[PDB]
Structure formats: structure tokens, C-alpha cells
Amino acid sequence: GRGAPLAKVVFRDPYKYRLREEIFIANEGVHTGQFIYAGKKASLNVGNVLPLGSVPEGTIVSNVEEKPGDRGALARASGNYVIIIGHNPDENKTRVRLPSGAKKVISSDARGVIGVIAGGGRVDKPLLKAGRAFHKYRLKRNSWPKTRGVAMNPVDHPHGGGNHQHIGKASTISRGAVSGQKAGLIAARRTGLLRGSQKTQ
Amino acid sequence: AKRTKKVGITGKYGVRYGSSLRRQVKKLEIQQHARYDCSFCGKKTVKRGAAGIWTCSCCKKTVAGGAYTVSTAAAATVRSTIRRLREMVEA
Amino acid sequence: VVDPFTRKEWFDIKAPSTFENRNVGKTLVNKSTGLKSASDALKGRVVEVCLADLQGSEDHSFRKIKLRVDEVQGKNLLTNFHGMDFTTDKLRSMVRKWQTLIEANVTVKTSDDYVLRIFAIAFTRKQANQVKRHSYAQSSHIRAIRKVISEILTKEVQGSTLAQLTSKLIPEVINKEIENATKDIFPLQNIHVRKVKLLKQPKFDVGALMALHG
Amino acid sequence: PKKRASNGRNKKGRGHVKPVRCVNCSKSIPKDKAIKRMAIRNIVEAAAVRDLSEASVYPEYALPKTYNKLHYCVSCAIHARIVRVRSREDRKNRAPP
Amino acid sequence: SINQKLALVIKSGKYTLGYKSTVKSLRQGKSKLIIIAANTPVLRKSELEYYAMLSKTKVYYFQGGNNELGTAVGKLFRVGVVSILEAGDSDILTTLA
Amino acid sequence: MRAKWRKKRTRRLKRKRRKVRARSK
Amino acid sequence: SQVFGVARIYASFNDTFVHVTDLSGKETIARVTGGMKVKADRDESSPYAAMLAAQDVAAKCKEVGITAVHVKIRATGGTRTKTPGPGGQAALRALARSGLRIGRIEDVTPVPSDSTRKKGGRRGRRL
RNA sequence: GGUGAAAUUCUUGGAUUUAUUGAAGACUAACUACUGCGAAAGCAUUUGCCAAGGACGUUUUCAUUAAUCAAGAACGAAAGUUAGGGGAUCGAAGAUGAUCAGAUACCGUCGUAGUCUUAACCAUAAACUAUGCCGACUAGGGAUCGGGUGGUGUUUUUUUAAUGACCCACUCGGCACCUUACGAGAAAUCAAAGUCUUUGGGUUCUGGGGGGAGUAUGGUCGCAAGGCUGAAACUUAAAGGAAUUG
Ligand SMILES: [Mg+2]
Ligand SMILES: [Mg+2]
Ligand SMILES: [Mg+2]
Ligand SMILES: [Mg+2]
Ligand SMILES: [Mg+2]
Ligand SMILES: [Mg+2]
Ligand SMILES: [Mg+2]
Ligand SMILES: [Mg+2]
Ligand SMILES: [Mg+2]
Ligand SMILES: [Mg+2]
Ligand SMILES: [Mg+2]
Ligand SMILES: [Mg+2]
Ligand SMILES: [Mg+2]
Ligand SMILES: [Mg+2]
Ligand SMILES: [Mg+2]
Ligand SMILES: [Mg+2]
Ligand SMILES: [Mg+2]
Ligand SMILES: [Mg+2]
Ligand SMILES: [Mg+2]
Ligand SMILES: [Mg+2]
Ligand SMILES: [Mg+2]
Ligand SMILES: [Mg+2]
Ligand SMILES: [Mg+2]
Ligand SMILES: [Mg+2]
Ligand SMILES: [Mg+2]
Ligand SMILES: [Mg+2]
Ligand SMILES: [Mg+2]
Ligand SMILES: [Mg+2]
Ligand SMILES: [Mg+2]
Ligand SMILES: [Mg+2]
Ligand SMILES: [Mg+2]
Ligand SMILES: [Mg+2]
Ligand SMILES: [Mg+2]
Ligand SMILES: [Mg+2]
Ligand SMILES: [Mg+2]
Ligand SMILES: [Mg+2]
Ligand SMILES: [Mg+2]
Ligand SMILES: [Zn+2]
Ligand SMILES: [Zn+2]
């Protein structure tokens, strides 16, 4: 139920004679037997984990923390990555652009891992038939298949009811709506086929 | 002994799903089934098994890759951009 | 009911060293109030003045120079190298029809570690007694000429910073050594360094900066 | 029939050049077919020269004119600049004047 | 080139191909030079380099995968180490290598 | 009418007989 | 001798700008354009309005602290006409004849290593 | 701001102007010419790498291996299609401001697709020199690009040279122009469009009054838009070319 492969990465224990194993999200091109370096003063190759400080802008980084030491949070899905676009040395920040395109500024002590996440393009292939969707969610959660509220009775949904299948009122619903009201396009600030190019400015 | 004018591996799907949808799948199945050249021993013995997990017949190396091809385009460009930027740390 | 002039702190612009008049210009700021003082805010501006306007002699009518302000002290702020341009009228003259153009450039580091990229333009000349009306190089000529220029330019830098690099450009030593190695290949005329820009200053180092001051 | 051995304008052994835009109406037009005027003229003008050097620092200064290449599109070259239109004979004459 | 030299060595000298045989050469002191594939693993590399320095044999690291070293010696299989046993007309021993 | 526009004329006209004839395939 | 500044005259068609600034540029000193001293839109670029605007410029110029100035004339440039506007000379004429000083002037029109498709369409602006 | 003139538009959100920086995509100004290269399409920043080519030089080598070509095939501007990316600029569509009797336009503003690139398609342009290829012959001239030969030629200084650029003469192969016209044409014109009723070097292709019509039909190719192949009934005395005078 994860799109991207994981990668078991074994380490020594600094304080006791033992191995300690971790579970990383495998960045693309990472291979068994490879050595992974993790730290402030580590070098800049795919697979190592380095604080957002220690990488020049344009570095491409995955599984990056929001807060330093929360052990990874951003860009973890098969194919995603964050780009560093700038640093503030005084008040040690860094500014990044997340997979959604939002620009966010975090501590430079927050760590990421050099590269992108393996399994890119997983979504390019048509699912092609019900059953593959069926098995997809079989390993995720019980969210499939989905019935249109407009096929229900009014008891079941705001869209339910009528002698023809229709929403009956606007399907844009307020942010200040209430549980039981919010089905449709919640808080939508526009609507209709996105004409023209998107992309954040 | 040419068997199909054009459906290739996609011929398993019969008349179903509509041509354009089968096309797209054919591209990515041809991708995801082929044997690939191994970086570590040069034998063409890398094959896939589960999206993004490419490993080697002999030599037994497993390389995390793209979902249906070993090297995704974008990671490849990323490679050289880590190339590039790292150069600015020794030199 | 303000008139920022009836409030404007004022100032005068001092020059570096290896030239002529260390007194250059005049400016306007704003009184050094607590929170937003006249000092740290601007200063670090940039003023461009023809070097003949600062060298006196008109055998330098072109060759604009860009200076950048670094430090301030009691109504007296200095300035250091930040660039060298050419006038538009000069090139727009220079580049005459019926001949060949040749451009070349290279990126290089100096002693006191400024990284800069200089340029170099040069045109073929009719040789006295020519009857044909144009006189062009031979491409294979232009490849040799660029390579030589490139060799010479990479040599003349990484010497004692701009200071000495500037001390080389001012008398156009470069233009003449170019001319020397060139004439083996092909005539040429004008031949200048034209442009040179900064793109990686080192660090402040106030002690080294004060070396053009007295 | 044909009314110009040079066709529109001058190109033999090429088949394709590269269009330039017309400084007047912005019309694309091949470079060899253009019509081009070197516009070198003073920054100042006729009358400003005396009061210039008058209210001017420097001994007479130096005076640096402005050079810029112009491009017209036949139609705009006909509507104003170099044209007239000439007799069938007066056409072949490439003498500048 | 470096391959142009190898092509001469191939048609006038004696050589063995492959890991095990060039160790019979390195121990026998018969090897005059060993060429090492780009992708041949570091362990085998480091070993060959230790066997070499124990026989005073120089080592030229071929900047190519064991596949192209196979066309370098003109064999339709792959090779990750060559051992020069006799250099024929070529000069590889007494040039840059 | 301009030859090019008269080309587009029948270019369309054909494409509509194309439609109409397929009604009886 | 004099205190020096930088003049900078943008004389396009349909308008003419004159505004001296500090020789570094980062600090202004009084603008006033050829549009301000007339109201007819059609008359936003004629030499008379440019004169009156050069007047209103030189006035505060000699009324703040700048006694002398270097000028930088400049057409629209870019992919535009690259030729000076009518009221560019009229303003230079009206600031030397005003009584300020003139020191070494050049043309700073942005000329490209050509591109970005000029406007108007391949068939030009046809009227 | 924008125009012939204006309006739509932008401006406490200090617009327009300015200075300092940074980002992105496109492009290659001037130099650029009756100048180069390529089968054509087409091709102007630097450098490195990869393979290729003509001309020239040639007392090398082979020895008829060739010329032109139904079928067949490689490449083929621009737009257009499929899938990614890219999407600064300009901008089919569309919406607007004006203009107009009207104005679905011309002009102004916004601006979707496109414009850029990768993997595929598509195969058409006034894809033009509106001019098949190979060979021979027939007439004067000054330029110019590449190669070569000749010189007690010029300029470069040093110690004379060597070089390099330049000058003059020549000869190959180019891109062109000039004047001629023995000759050709219906003429405009043409060193071929010449050596043709004094009608034959070799060979490929196409046309047979105008419309109907590149339409109908079949075959074939394409995802599509469309490409190639491609009639007839009927209609009609002109359609057409070049030149002259008005
Ligand atoms: Mg994942
Ligand atoms: Mg779910
Ligand atoms: Mg369920
Ligand atoms: Mg449903
Ligand atoms: Mg649904
Ligand atoms: Mg129901
Ligand atoms: Mg209800
Ligand atoms: Mg409701
Ligand atoms: Mg309902
Ligand atoms: Mg419905
Ligand atoms: Mg069978
Ligand atoms: Mg040479
Ligand atoms: Mg043309
Ligand atoms: Mg063409
Ligand atoms: Mg039906
Ligand atoms: Mg008109
Ligand atoms: Mg250029
Ligand atoms: Mg057949
Ligand atoms: Mg195309
Ligand atoms: Mg766009
Ligand atoms: Mg419209
Ligand atoms: Mg309207
Ligand atoms: Mg319309
Ligand atoms: Mg419009
Ligand atoms: Mg055709
Ligand atoms: Mg033509
Ligand atoms: Mg034709
Ligand atoms: Mg002749
Ligand atoms: Mg000679
Ligand atoms: Mg004749
Ligand atoms: Mg005659
Ligand atoms: Mg007929
Ligand atoms: Mg059919
Ligand atoms: Mg398709
Ligand atoms: Mg068809
Ligand atoms: Mg046909
Ligand atoms: Mg048909
Ligand atoms: Zn392997
Ligand atoms: Zn025009």
C-alpha cells in the first residue's frame, strides 16, 4: 500500500555494541550494499541525509523534516521531492518548494535526503479495469468503490432525492459549514475546467 | 511469423478498454517487463518486481528505480544537478 | 507639509587610489535616526563615471567605470572597483561594415579573491595598399585569434587582484600584447578589453579594503 | 510577367535566409529582401550645439553621435523612406544616392 | 589512442584475458601490465592492485566498462581485466602507461 | 472567391458528405 | 567645481521624462514629465511640453543642491522603435539654456542581442 | 499607457520613471554583403567531442565499374495530432474598447491553443530559378568565394630571412553581375530559353480548349486533419499569354 519502495539501512550504535536498523524511503538510484552518510558534515550525494543548511540552493531533497528531528515529513510519495530555493544565514532558515508548489521556510537544522523518491510515474499507467482499483485499495483502506450522493435518497445525502439525478443546489459549500453539510466542493474559490496554464508564480 | 499488426503484449486485453487506453498500457508494460543493462557488472540482467524495485539476475544487486523503467527521466537530470552542485564544494 | 529635502542628510563621494582625483561626487540620504540610520542602510550604492571625467585626460573618452561604496566615516565614504563598461557611441562607431568582428571572453579569479569575467573585441583592418574593398579573416583565423586572446587574458589576471589588474587595464598593456601575438595571424584594428564584470567578490576584509586610502 | 531579375530582392544560392521585423509597422520580412538605412545622426541637432558647449563643462567636449540600423518592409519603405518608384530603366540602377 | 595501442598489442603480442589467469600471471611475474575495467568491483580491483605491487607490475585503469574493454581487445565477450604478457610491436609499456 | 478559400470550401463540403455517408455504413 | 548628479531623459513618443538623480542613482532629485505640463494626451510628447518640463526640473534642481549633471538620453528600446522621441532634444536644449551645467553624455537605450518576438503579428500593423 | 484621434487599462497598492540585485524561457542584434555551406527542406554566440563533404593538388590505385530512371525508399518549412516536460515572448480561439449604416474585421486590451523541447505521427508550401538530369559545342568583360602555380612585387625588422597579411599574372571549380547578341522567342526576355522544317547525343517526367473538378467512385496511407491515386454525365466560344495605345 505504498507507491515507493522502502530501503532497510543498517547503522552501528554509537553507545552500545550492536547494529540498529532503520527504514528509509528509497531515493531513486539507491542500491543494496551502498553506503549512506547521515550528518551535518556529510557530503552531497544521492541517498545521504543532510540538514537543509548544508546544501546549496537547487539541491533536490526528499523525506524532509518540518521541524528538525521529526524524522521526515515532506515529499515522501513515489516521485516527489523538494527543492531548496534559498537560505537565511542569520536566523538559520532555508526556503523550499514542496511537491504542491507551496513555498515553505523551515529551520536549516531540519534534515532531508539527497535525491528524489523511487517509483516515479506509477500513476501514468491506466488502472484499466475495476479490479486493479479494487486491489489497489485492498491494501490501503476501505474507500472503494464510491457511490454518487446523487444516486442516494435524501435520507442518505444532501444530493439524495429528486425524480431526476441532480444536485438541486450549489455544490460549493462554506468553510463554515457543519458536519452533514460538507459534501461537494468545500470552500471552492473557483470551479470549472481549468483553462490555461497553472503553475505558481 | 508476425502475430499481431499492432497490439503486441496488449493483445491479452481483447477488444476491451478502448484502443487509446490500451496503447498507454502497452508503452509502460514494454517498459516494465524488459531486461535492463546492469550498472555494476554490465550484464543485461536487471528486471523488475514491484514498482520501483529493479534487481539483477546474476550479481544480485537491487537498484531503486522508476515505477516502470529503471531510470526515470527526472531523477536522471537530478543526478547531474547533484553532480553539478557537488563540484562547487571541492572546487 | 514635509518636503524631504528639509530633512535630507547629505554626503560626498570619495574615490579609490590608482587614478587621479579621489574626490568624485555628491549624494543624499536621510538623518541617522534610531531605527533606520543613514549608515548601514544604503551607502553600498554604485556610481558610474567616465574615467576621463576622473583621469582628466581625454585619451580615455570612453571606458566608463563602475564604483561601489563599502565603508563610511564622518561625511566621507570611500568606493572600490565594481566594473568597467564601454560607451555606446564608441562601439556603434567601431563596428563598421565591410569588415569582420571578433569577440572573446573568459572567467577568472584574482589574488585577493574576486572572480570576474573580462571581454575583448577586435576588428580586421584593411592593410595599406589593398585593392579589394572588404578584407575579411578566414574563420580558421578567428579561431586562432580567439585562442590567443583567451591565452593572454587568462594570464593577465590572477595577478595582484583588481588593483594590479586595474593597473594593467588603465595603460592597456593587454591591448598591445594582443596586438603583438595577433599580427602573426591577421592584421586587426581597435582591439580593446571593452567589458569586464564582477560576479564573486570575496569578503569585506576592512583591512585590505583600506589599502587604497591615505 | 516577372518584373525583377533579382525577384523581390537579392538572394541566389540560399533558398532561405531569416526574417527581420520592420521598424515601422513591425512586419516580418526576409533580411536580404529588407531595405536598410544606417541612421547616424547627432545626439543634439542643428541649433542646440552653441548653447550646449555654452552651458557645458570641458573644452568643446567631444560630441558623440548616435548610430542605429534601420529596417523597412517595402510597403513602409514605399510609404516614406527609400522609394520614389522609378522608370522601368531607372529601376536596375543600384547606384545609392 | 589507448585503444589503438591495445589493437596493436592484440595482433603482435601475448596476453591473457580474465581474472583468474592474470593472477597466474601476476604471481609468475609474467605480467608486464594489467588493464582494469571501470565497473569491476573495488574488492577485485584492490586485490589485483595488491598482487600487482607485490610483483612490481604497473596498473592502467581503463575508463570503460568490462563490455567496451571487450571490444578494446576485439573479443565479442566482456572482460574486466587484461594482462599484457608480451607487448609486440606496440609501445604501451614505455609510453604514458 | 479566393482560390484558397474555395479550397477550404470543398474541403469542408467533403468532410460533411463524409459524415452523411457514414450515417448509412 | 560643481556638485554633480545624473540627468537621464527618456524621450519616447507619446511622452517625455526628465528626472535628475544622485550620481549613484539610488537617490532621486525631482522628476516632472512632458505629460504634466499640458492636458491633451495628443500633446503629451511635443517639444514645448518637454521644454516646460525641463524647466520645472531644472528649477528644483538648482533649488535643492545639484548645480551640474550628466545626461543619459534613451528611446523606448527593447523590441520597440530604438529611435529617440521628439521632445528629447527640446528638454536638453531647455536645461542647458536654463543655466545648469552639462558633463559628458551617452545613449543608454536598451538594445538587445535581438529577440522576444516583436509585437504586431507577422503581417505587421496594417492601417 | 496607448492611437489619426480616443476609450477599455494601471495608479497610498507610490503606479510610469529610478537604483541594486535574482529568477525563467526564448533568441543570436550590429559585424551580415548580389558573400559561404547542404540532395532539398534549410543552416550565423563560445568551445570540446562525434562522424561526413565538395573544390583543389596528384608521373597514386582500380579499369568501364557508368548516365538517366516505373516500382520501391531516405529526408522534407510552417501549421496540425499523441505523450511528457516547458510555458518568458508573441499570440489562431474567445471576451472586450473604439471605430462603422453595419464592423463577427482592420486599430487597442485581456488572452486559451500554439509558439520551446523530448519520444512518436503528419508529408504538404508561390516546397520558386514558377525553368529535369548527364554530355558536347557556340562570346566579350570587370568583380568576388575555395584550391593551386608563377615573382632578384609591396608592407610587416632583427641581422637577413622564415612566417602572415597585401599586390600583380595565370588556371581549375564555385555564387553572381556587366555588355553584347552570330543565334532564339508570341513577346517580356534568354549564354541558354542557343547550336530546331538545314527538324535525331542519352534518358526521366508531365500537358492536349474552358468550366464541370482535384469533384464523384474504388484502392491505399493516417489517430485525426488529411495525403497519394483519380473519372464521367452535362455545360460552354472562348478561357488564356505577352506587348501597344488609351
Ligand atoms: Mg511513498
Ligand atoms: Mg483511500
Ligand atoms: Mg467497500
Ligand atoms: Mg461513483
Ligand atoms: Mg465519484
Ligand atoms: Mg435511488
Ligand atoms: Mg438532507
Ligand atoms: Mg443543502
Ligand atoms: Mg437531489
Ligand atoms: Mg445530473
Ligand atoms: Mg505462428
Ligand atoms: Mg591560417
Ligand atoms: Mg527569398
Ligand atoms: Mg524556399
Ligand atoms: Mg445511425
Ligand atoms: Mg496602408
Ligand atoms: Mg552575434
Ligand atoms: Mg506494385
Ligand atoms: Mg514541422
Ligand atoms: Mg504560452
Ligand atoms: Mg474576436
Ligand atoms: Mg463591438
Ligand atoms: Mg469572430
Ligand atoms: Mg483585435
Ligand atoms: Mg505540390
Ligand atoms: Mg521565388
Ligand atoms: Mg515546380
Ligand atoms: Mg563568359
Ligand atoms: Mg605564392
Ligand atoms: Mg546570341
Ligand atoms: Mg532584340
Ligand atoms: Mg481539357
Ligand atoms: Mg472509398
Ligand atoms: Mg495515435
Ligand atoms: Mg480518403
Ligand atoms: Mg492526381
Ligand atoms: Mg477520392
Ligand atoms: Zn549485475
Ligand atoms: Zn513596415
Side-chain angles (χ1 to χ4, degrees), chain A residues 1-200, chain B, chain C, chain D, chain E, chain F, chain G residues 1-21 25 28-47 49-50 53-54 58-59 64-127:
Chain A
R2 191 180 306 246
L6 298 173
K8 317 264 180 59
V9 179
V10 194
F11 292 93
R12 262 170 74 246
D13 192 328
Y15 315 91
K16 189 182 166 181
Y17 176 62
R18 69 157 88 184
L19 282 67
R20 278 224 252 73
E21 155 178 318
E22 240 91 24
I23 296 171
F24 282 169
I25 315 168
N27 264 12
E28 181 157 329
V30 159
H31 67 83
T32 32
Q34 164 185 353
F35 286 121
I36 256 56
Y37 303 91
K40 175 157 140 177
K41 272 185 191 172
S43 91
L44 209 176
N45 335 88
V46 180
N48 298 335
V49 6
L50 279 75
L52 256 20
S54 322
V55 267
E57 20 194 80
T59 316
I60 289 193
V61 137
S62 90
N63 198 12
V64 13
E65 316 186 296
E66 263 153 341
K67 305 178 206 153
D70 68 12
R71 313 177 75 187
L74 312 184
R76 309 167 85 248
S78 94
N80 303 129
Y81 56 85
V82 319
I83 310 184
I84 294 105
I85 59 182
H87 297 70
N88 187 6
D90 302 17
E91 334 142 12
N92 61 334
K93 311 307 196 28
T94 293
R95 192 189 211 201
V96 281
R97 157 161 279 108
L98 314 188
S100 73
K103 294 193 280 293
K104 188 175 178 184
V105 35
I106 47 190
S107 177
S108 290
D109 302 332
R111 312 179 270 148
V113 7
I114 301 293
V116 323
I117 283 149
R122 170 181 51 80
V123 296
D124 300 345
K125 181 140 130 106
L127 239 5
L128 225 225
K129 46 176 183 159
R132 309 200 160 157
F134 166 88
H135 288 293
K136 181 175 182 181
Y137 297 92
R138 190 178 110 255
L139 282 118
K140 302 203 155 282
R141 45 200 84 71
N142 175 19
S143 68
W144 185 103
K146 310 189 176 67
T147 314
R148 301 162 309 150
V150 107
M152 334 233 284
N153 290 122
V155 113
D156 310 306
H157 209 268
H159 304 176
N163 285 38
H164 311 273
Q165 279 197 14
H166 73 90
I167 304 294
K169 291 184 153 299
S171 80
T172 31
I173 279 86
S174 171
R175 254 287 136 66
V178 139
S179 296
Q181 310 200 320
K182 273 180 200 182
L185 307 178
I186 307 182
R189 35 196 141 211
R190 67 153 302 278
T191 192
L193 165 47
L194 285 178
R195 321 301 270 264
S197 170
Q198 294 337 114
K199 312 247 166 166
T200 177
Chain B
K2 190 195 44 161
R3 276 189 245 97
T4 43
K5 183 168 177 177
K6 67 188 58 211
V7 304
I9 191 178
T10 240
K12 42 178 166 177
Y13 301 119
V15 99
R16 275 156 274 153
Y17 312 127
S19 49
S20 277
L21 278 187
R22 290 186 259 111
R23 266 208 333 262
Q24 245 298 309
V25 167
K26 182 188 173 175
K27 169 192 191 53
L28 296 174
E29 280 186 26
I30 291 164
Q31 228 151 121
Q32 74 167 110
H33 292 159
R35 272 180 199 225
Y36 284 89
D37 284 321
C38 181
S39 306
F40 303 80
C41 80
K43 296 186 177 157
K44 70 163 327 91
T45 64
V46 183
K47 221 164 163 291
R48 198 259 247 168
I53 295 184
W54 307 76
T55 122
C56 196
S57 302
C58 119
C59 128
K60 309 288 182 187
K61 275 273 177 307
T62 303
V63 172
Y68 319 102
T69 169
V70 183
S71 192
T72 209
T77 88
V78 173
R79 227 182 304 280
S80 58
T81 282
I82 299 305
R83 264 295 282 173
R84 185 171 77 67
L85 290 169
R86 190 178 48 256
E87 320 290 58
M88 290 165 29
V89 167
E90 21 275 55
Chain C
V1 197
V2 258
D3 248 313
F5 310 124
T6 329
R7 171 233 304 165
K8 269 297 169 176
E9 164 92 30
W10 219 64
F11 223 100
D12 61 77
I13 287 105
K14 268 266 172 54
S17 192
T18 64
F19 322 92
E20 173 71 294
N21 57 281
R22 304 197 79 255
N23 324 272
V24 161
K26 310 290 196 173
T27 19
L28 301 89
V29 189
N30 267 331
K31 186 174 173 56
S32 313
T33 54
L35 309 187
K36 203 67 58 57
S37 71
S39 309
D40 61 334
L42 20 287
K43 307 179 321 300
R45 303 181 178 184
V46 152
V47 13
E48 180 184 46
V49 65
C50 174
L51 82 317
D53 281 325
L54 78 98
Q55 215 79 310
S57 196
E58 246 58 53
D59 42 81
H60 274 80
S61 42
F62 19 87
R63 298 151 80 133
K64 300 126 58 60
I65 295 289
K66 231 152 183 274
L67 280 304
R68 172 200 41 168
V69 166
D70 298 51
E71 280 279 356
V72 104
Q73 50 182 19
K75 322 296 259 198
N76 220 19
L77 86 186
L78 230 287
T79 193
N80 184 4
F81 204 113
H82 191 215
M84 171 207 189
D85 199 56
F86 245 52
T87 62
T88 50
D89 50 288
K90 188 43 175 178
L91 286 94
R92 232 55 76 83
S93 143
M94 294 196 178
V95 182
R96 197 72 79 156
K97 252 189 147 199
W98 269 219
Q99 75 186 14
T100 315
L101 213 156
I102 296 190
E103 310 233 61
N105 32 17
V106 66
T107 73
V108 55
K109 198 176 191 62
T110 48
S111 72
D112 155 45
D113 300 284
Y114 279 88
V115 181
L116 45 103
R117 170 190 314 127
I118 86 180
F119 293 68
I121 193 172
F123 314 78
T124 74
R125 86 165 172 261
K126 265 182 178 184
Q127 159 180 355
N129 87 98
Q130 221 115 150
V131 355
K132 57 178 181 183
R133 207 186 149 211
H134 54 90
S135 97
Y136 295 117
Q138 276 268 265
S139 313
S140 64
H141 290 161
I142 318 180
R143 301 182 226 118
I145 296 186
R146 280 197 293 261
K147 186 149 289 186
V148 162
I149 291 167
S150 310
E151 152 102 357
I152 299 180
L153 294 192
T154 46
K155 291 187 300 91
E156 302 312 297
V157 207
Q158 78 278 157
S160 162
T161 331
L162 353 307
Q164 185 161 309
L165 196 284
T166 318
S167 302
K168 291 170 200 159
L169 313 182
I170 301 169
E172 49 204 301
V173 176
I174 330 297
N175 294 21
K176 274 294 112 178
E177 181 180 348
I178 299 291
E179 161 109 314
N180 273 325
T182 302
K183 74 136 284 79
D184 284 325
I185 317 290
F186 202 82
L188 267 68
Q189 60 198 350
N190 275 358
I191 308 179
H192 314 261
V193 294
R194 204 188 59 84
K195 229 112 295 186
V196 34
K197 58 200 295 187
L198 280 70
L199 32 286
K200 275 241 58 181
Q201 49 136 92
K203 187 44 68 59
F204 210 169
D205 189 9
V206 284
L209 166 64
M210 270 280 197
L212 287 196
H213 312 167
Chain D
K2 212 159 171 277
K3 86 147 192 190
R4 259 183 273 264
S6 79
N7 283 261
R9 250 177 102 92
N10 174 34
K11 145 238 171 311
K12 274 162 183 296
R14 234 159 311 272
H16 180 265
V17 274
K18 183 141 307 166
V20 302
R21 310 302 282 285
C22 169
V23 71
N24 186 268
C25 71
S26 316
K27 183 200 193 74
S28 169
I29 164 171
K31 175 170 186 158
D32 68 309
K33 198 177 188 291
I35 220 232
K36 304 115 165 176
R37 263 55 205 146
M38 260 301 183
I40 50 267
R41 272 172 289 101
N42 286 282
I43 351 89
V44 264
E45 48 202 13
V49 38
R50 188 177 183 271
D51 316 84
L52 184 269
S53 61
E54 221 72 78
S56 290
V57 159
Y58 314 115
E60 102 96 61
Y61 179 49
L63 208 287
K65 332 94 59 174
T66 42
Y67 326 64
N68 108 89
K69 234 238 241 278
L70 274 305
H71 300 264
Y72 296 92
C73 71
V74 178
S75 298
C76 288
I78 299 224
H79 193 71
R81 220 93 300 204
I82 259 291
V83 225
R84 254 27 59 168
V85 107
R86 306 126 88 190
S87 83
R88 172 83 148 162
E89 236 84 302
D90 287 53
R91 277 206 235 287
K92 322 180 173 184
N93 189 249
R94 331 193 97 203
Chain E
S1 167
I2 176 56
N3 307 110
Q4 180 79 353
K5 295 173 170 310
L6 264 184
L8 217 300
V9 186
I10 230 59
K11 49 165 184 164
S12 71
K14 284 124 68 184
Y15 62 108
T16 192
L17 299 183
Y19 168 73
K20 285 169 57 202
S21 64
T22 75
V23 182
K24 250 109 76 185
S25 89
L26 247 29
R27 288 190 301 243
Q28 256 140 57
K30 287 194 177 292
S31 171
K32 270 64 184 299
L33 197 277
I34 64 161
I35 316 154
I36 283 198
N39 67 345
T40 170
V42 180
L43 193 41
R44 165 144 306 169
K45 163 151 78 147
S46 222
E47 199 187 24
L48 290 172
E49 302 173 336
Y50 200 93
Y51 268 98
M53 80 88 178
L54 275 177
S55 79
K56 304 165 70 172
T57 310
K58 279 116 101 182
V59 170
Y60 180 54
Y61 314 86
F62 195 76
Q63 204 180 5
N66 48 15
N67 284 316
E68 29 279 75
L69 192 43
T71 343
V73 295
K75 271 65 232 299
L76 295 81
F77 53 90
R78 59 187 58 96
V79 10
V81 58
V82 187
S83 189
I84 313 290
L85 301 170
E86 278 305 333
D89 173 46
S90 160
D91 45 3
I92 31 133
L93 265 281
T94 69
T95 70
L96 37 73
Chain F
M1 69 165 320
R2 160 128 94 125
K4 142 140 66 167
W5 303 152
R6 160 100 162 100
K7 188 173 187 178
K8 173 202 287 269
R9 246 257 235 291
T10 95
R11 229 80 165 270
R12 296 168 180 170
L13 182 276
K14 273 187 297 188
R15 183 176 39 182
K16 207 166 176 312
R17 312 208 265 238
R18 217 175 302 164
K19 241 73 184 296
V20 165
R21 237 187 113 182
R23 296 186 121 251
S24 134
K25 247 191 310 224
Chain G
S1 300
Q2 319 285 323
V3 14
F4 257 150
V6 75
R8 302 170 174 184
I9 304 187
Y10 179 8
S12 79
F13 310 79
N14 320 320
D15 206 345
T16 41
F17 288 79
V18 163
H19 74 336
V20 48
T21 104
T28 185
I29 24 208
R31 182 150 98 265
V32 158
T33 105
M36 288 170 50
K37 296 300 197 72
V38 71
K39 289 298 197 72
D41 247 354
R42 153 176 44 188
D43 303 337
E44 255 187 358
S45 49
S46 47
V64 168
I66 265 52
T67 65
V69 77
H70 304 182
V71 342
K72 291 168 156 59
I73 201 73
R74 169 194 183 273
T76 305
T79 89
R80 287 264 176 90
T81 176
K82 101 226 280 294
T83 274
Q89 339 303 324
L92 213 288
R93 154 99 120 176
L95 50 83
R97 180 192 235 79
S98 102
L100 288 166
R101 318 295 293 168
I102 293 308
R104 190 152 264 153
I105 64 185
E106 72 167 342
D107 187 40
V108 287
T109 65
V111 157
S113 327
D114 89 315
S115 200
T116 62
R117 178 129 203 169
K118 198 174 184 290
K119 95 159 304 173
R122 163 191 192 74
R123 263 146 54 99
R125 188 182 164 268
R126 49 210 114 84
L127 77 315

